[PDB]
């Protein structure tokens, strides 16, 4: 079995050089596969293997030279498999990528950072390997900028970031796998302890293996398209995996850092700079299986994982806390408790006495974090309960309380530094997970709350709301806020549509504060689209009403979007219920779909200058809602400058941003993952309060204006005005596939009969990913820089002078190199050959041709000559996903000739070793074709990861 | 019960059936599920009062300034319109919350319970309009 000799010789190929001296990752992938394909032999027999093998050789010789003859070769292969070999081919290269990302993990998690190797600008915040950790960012604001340490402190005690986790756009993988995946990475790691005993060695080797079968041995499809409460529960996988203990941890690096500048107080632990906040279960945009009921149980479910949480954590606390002197208030409270009925801690203690108060209190506290636990599982599973509200935490200041109390007492005893302990941690998870962990948003379209007012005004017989110009809306909305009378009853004629928009506000009413951010409006475009949400919410009596953001989606919503602003601070209703706060959202794929990537980019950041002037007109604390496909929504390094880049101002000390389901793996599944993640997030924002990134020379505004106009034509003139541009769409792409199987929950479509303007922007995203042309994310570059260059023969200097030293620039170009990256025209070609009718090839001809003539534009604009030139690690790790990636594709292709064309008759081959064909029963279409192409999905999906 | 009784005298043994049976029977429809049906009976001045409140609380004017045909007049509007008329946001004394909550109660239990509301010092179309409609209002 020297088979072993050639995929180290294929992946040395694939990474020649070492991206340090802690370069281990070629050889930890080679460590992985090897045990990956002796359990697949040893599973489906030794032709199988060999086939798999000879797949994988091909695709590493295509990633290195990119000779089609090496697609036709897998492609010959891929044809002549029957589905049985397909499904387990397909199966085989999924998981083969997955142990690629965990090796990536693994190295991206130990590599050593090189102090030698940063250059001294804010070029070093774009890669992990030189960013600026939290004490680099204390020092460089009190060096460069002269801050004092008070200063950066109390910009820290009053800072804010807020991470939101979205359902992912496809497989959010199952929290069992997520297990696996660790328990593997873990295995990984500590076979190269340069210290381990060979008994040790070998016991770890073998549970690696017993964990890549374990995970390869798992179905990944039947059951169902798991529901709303399913998601949730997957997405809520790392509360439990790593940001609960995470936490508490990053805070107190925080206070060490802070000690380092001579601070010597720690962050208050009732400091909110770490909160989350989840749309699983809130956004309902476009997404039917979103009910109001999901809603109240995604709320409950959260409730009982915290009070879970929080039971477990207090009983080391309880053991902790065995001292015995006091505050005179702790002894008060603890006599006062003693006065009462002990049953959580029977294997414990039979009773507590007096002598512990601490343990008095904090065992009451247990006491009610498990009857808040069963009421919300009474509340869930029934809709009553028996528990009584007053033994129960409703509220955070009922938790926080008694530790408070315990804090302040053991500080006053000067025990401070036991306080400091476990206590402290627990006082800071309380302060950030609330009573919830999450804060679920609520999202709906606009035209749904004018369905509502509609309904209701022509049940009022005034006219139609909808017929109304917007100035008669807003005087009509202004009245009846202002007005002492209610709007509506039962009796009133209620859609399916508006029925759930009315019952999704009174399940808003019927629950705690503590478990709502904001109400979120897509596709808002005025004052009275806001408007129309408060009223709602007044009128369906939600006591504590949410925040209401607007999110701005198409190009002229942005540009109108500063003056709709104002015109909403300048009344007085509004202005008076916001109390000072206004959070507004930009969507950087939804306008990118609108009008192309680069044209967004520009309008998003001119449209946060104009927001941040109009708040600061009216005085208002302006929050800007970071959707996905930005620059910082980005997984690792990248995020840093990221948010390093926004305009001045736009953060200040509250930094909202969504955490996107195809990166949440690479930026919470591992220990030291998380805390760098919530490091450059807390670092970022404090350095970008405090130093913000150089205002634009006006010349670069104005090559910007140009530029974005010309590349808004070239997208809009193919996307939109070529007429057979939506037939190659079809074609070219497996969109249709990807609506019609079970990989999002959502519809991929608004109107089913519409053009890409009815398309979602997830799906359009999406498309274009698995044919590895990412078409979304470059159309529009090409045209605007080849415009500004022939229009002056040194607007290429500007443009070079604007990504050495213009952040946003620099980040935006970064971005689309990194996306490129991920691009092969070849492989678009193949989809185009076996896919899409003849006269339209020339269609995609021209089509990548502005692909590659974007991607050498990107590069001159780059100053580069390789894609990735400035990041090697990357541009790494990035190739030996390719690798696997690519036969995926291939296979992708294929099938979807075999699915869409019966006529297209294969010579297949002999069936290959013992079974999966059998698990996809009530299938439509082949035995195991369509379990095939879902397979052949994810994977890409998981691959390619984020782009736009 | 009507069906023992049916299938009895299908039987030839209305005899029977018009034993025990029919005093049954005729127990359950002379008592009912209550034996007795509860009528409500308050002054019209408590609901005049109620009405003063709300149209004080709208900025409309005294409902009981308003000579009887007014108070007719926007009596009928408000029965024939289809927008509800109050809400928790109501300055309500101790009075006006024993008359509306009353409602709710009438509201929330079965109609066999109940007979006849009844006003006291009853004179004119308006206090009767005014029942009706704290009724509607009431849910
Ligand atoms: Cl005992």
């Given at each position: 079995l020297e088979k072993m000799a050639s995929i180290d010789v294929h992946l040395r190929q694939l990474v020649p050089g070492k991206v340090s001296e802690d370069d281990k990752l070629v050889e930890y992938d080679a460590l992985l596969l090897d045990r990956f394909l002796d359990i697949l032999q040893d599973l489906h027999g030794e032709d199988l293997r060999e086939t798999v093998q000879e797949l994988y050789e091909h695709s590493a010789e295509y990633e290195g030279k990119h000779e089609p003859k090496k697609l036709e070769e897998l492609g010959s292969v891929l044809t002549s498999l029957d589905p049985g070999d397909s499904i387990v081919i397909a199966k085989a290269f999924s998981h083969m990528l997955n142990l690629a990302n965990l090796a990536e993990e693994v190295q991206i998690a130990y590599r050593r950072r090189i102090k030698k190797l940063k250059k001294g600008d804010f070029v070093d915040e774009s890669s992990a390997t030189t960013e600026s950790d939290l004490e680099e960012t204390f020092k460089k604001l009190v060096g460069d900028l002269n801050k004092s340490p008070e200063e950066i402190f109390d910009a820290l005690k009053n800072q804010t970031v807020d991470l939101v986790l979205t359902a992912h756009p496809t497989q959010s993988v199952r929290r069992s796998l997520l297990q696996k995946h660790g328990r593997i990475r873990d295995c990984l790691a500590q076979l190269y302890?340069?210290?381990?005993?060979p008994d040790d060695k070998q016991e770890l080797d073998e549970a690696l293996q017993r964990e890549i079968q374990a995970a390869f041995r798992t179905?990944?499809?039947?059951?169902?398209?798991?529901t709303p409460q399913d998601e949730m529960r997957a997405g809520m996988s790392y509360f439990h995996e790593t940001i609960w203990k995470g936490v508490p941890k990053f805070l107190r690096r925080v206070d060490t850092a802070l000690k380092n500048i001579g601070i010597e107080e720690r962050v208050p632990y009732n400091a909110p700079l770490i909160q989350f906040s989840s749309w699983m279960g809130g956004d309902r945009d476009g997404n039917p299986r979103v009910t109001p009921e999901v809603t109240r149980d995604v709320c409950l479910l959260a409730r009982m994982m915290a009070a879970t949480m929080y039971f477990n954590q207090i009983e080391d606390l309880m053991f902790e806390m065995s001292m015995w002197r006091c505050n005179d208030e702790l002894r008060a409270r603890a006599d006062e408790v003693h006065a009462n009925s002990a049953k959580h801690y029977i294997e414990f203690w039979k009773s507590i006495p007096t002598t512990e108060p601490y343990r008095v209190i904090l065992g009451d506290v247990r006491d009610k974090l498990y009857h808040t636990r069963e009421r919300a599982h009474q509340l869930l599973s029934n809709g009553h309960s028996d528990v009584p509200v007053e033994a129960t935490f409703i509220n955070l200041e009922q938790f926080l309380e008694p530790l408070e109390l315990c804090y302040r007492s053991l500080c006053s005893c000067g025990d401070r530094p036991i306080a400091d302990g476990s206590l402290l941690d627990f006082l800071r998870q309380v302060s950030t997970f609330g009573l919830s962990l999450v804060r679920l948003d609520i999202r709906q379209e606009s035209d749904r709350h004018t369905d509502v007012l509609d309904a209701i005004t022509t049940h009022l017989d005034i006219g139609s709301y909808r017929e109304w110009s917007e100035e008669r809306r807003q005087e009509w909305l202004l009245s009846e806020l202002s007005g002492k009378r209610p709007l509506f009853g039962s009796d009133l004629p209620k859609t399916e549509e508006i029925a759930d928009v009315l019952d999704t506000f009174h399940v808003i009413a019927e629950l705690?504060?503590?478990?709502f951010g904001a109400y979120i409006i897509s596709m808002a475009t005025a004052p009275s689209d806001v408007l129309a949400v408060e009223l709602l919410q007044r009128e369906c009596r939600v006591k504590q009403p949410l925040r209401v953001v607007p999110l701005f989606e198409k190009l002229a919503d942005l540009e109108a979007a500063p003056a709709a602003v104002a015109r909403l601070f300048s009344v007085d209703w509004y202005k008076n219920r916001i109390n000072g706060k206004q959070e507004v959202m930009i969507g950087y794929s939804d306008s990118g779909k609108d009008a192309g990537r680069l044209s967004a980019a520009w309008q998003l950041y001119k449209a946060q200058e104009e927001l941040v002037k109009v708040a600061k007109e009216y005085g208002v604390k302006l929050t800007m809602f970071h959707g996905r496909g930005?620059?910082?929504?980005?997984?690792?390094?990248p995020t840093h400058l990221a948010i390093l880049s926004q305009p001045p101002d736009t953060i200040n000390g509250s930094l909202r941003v969504t955490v996107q389901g195809e990166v949440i793996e690479q930026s919470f599944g591992e220990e030291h993952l998380c805390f760098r993640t919530l490091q450059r997030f807390t670092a970022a924002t404090l350095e970008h309060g405090m130093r913000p990134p150089i205002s634009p020379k006006p010349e670069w505004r104005a090559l910007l204006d140009e530029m974005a106009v010309v590349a808004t034509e070239e997208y809009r003139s193919v996307?939109?005005?070529?007429?057979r541009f939506v037939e190659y769409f079809r074609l070219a792409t497996p969109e249709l596939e990807y609506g019609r199987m079970n990989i999002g929950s959502r519809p991929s479509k608004r109107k089913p009969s519409g053009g890409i303007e009815s398309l979602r922007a997830i799906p359009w995203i999406f498309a274009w990913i698995q044919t590895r042309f990412h078409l979304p994310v470059w159309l529009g570059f090409g045209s605007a820089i080849r415009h500004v260059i022939e229009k002056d023969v040194r607007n290429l200097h500007m443009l070079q002078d604007m990504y050495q030293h213009w952040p946003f620039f620099r980040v935006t170009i970064d971005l689309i190199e990194m996306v490129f990256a991920k691009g092969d025209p070849g492989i678009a070609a193949l989809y185009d050959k076996l896919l899409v009718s003849e006269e339209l090839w020339p269609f995609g001809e021209k089509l990548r041709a502005n692909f590659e003539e974007t991607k050498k534009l990107i590069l001159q604009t780059a100053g580069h000559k390789d894609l990735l030139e400035g990041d090697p690690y990357l541009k790494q790790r990035l190739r030996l996903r390719d690798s696997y990636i690519t036969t995926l594709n291939v296979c992708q292709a294929y099938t979807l000739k075999r699915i869409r064309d019966p006529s297209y008759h294969v010579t297949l081959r002999p069936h290959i070793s013992k079974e999966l064909?059998?698990?996809?029963?009530?299938?439509?279409?082949a035995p195991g074709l369509e379990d095939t192409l879902i397979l052949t999905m994810k994977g890409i999906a998981a691959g390619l990861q984020n782009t736009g």
């Open positions: 302890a340069k210290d381990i005993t179905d990944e499809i039947k059951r169902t398209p798991p705690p504060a503590d478990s930005g620059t910082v929504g980005r997984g690792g390094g996307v939109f005005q070529e007429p064909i059998e698990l996809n029963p009530t299938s439509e279409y």
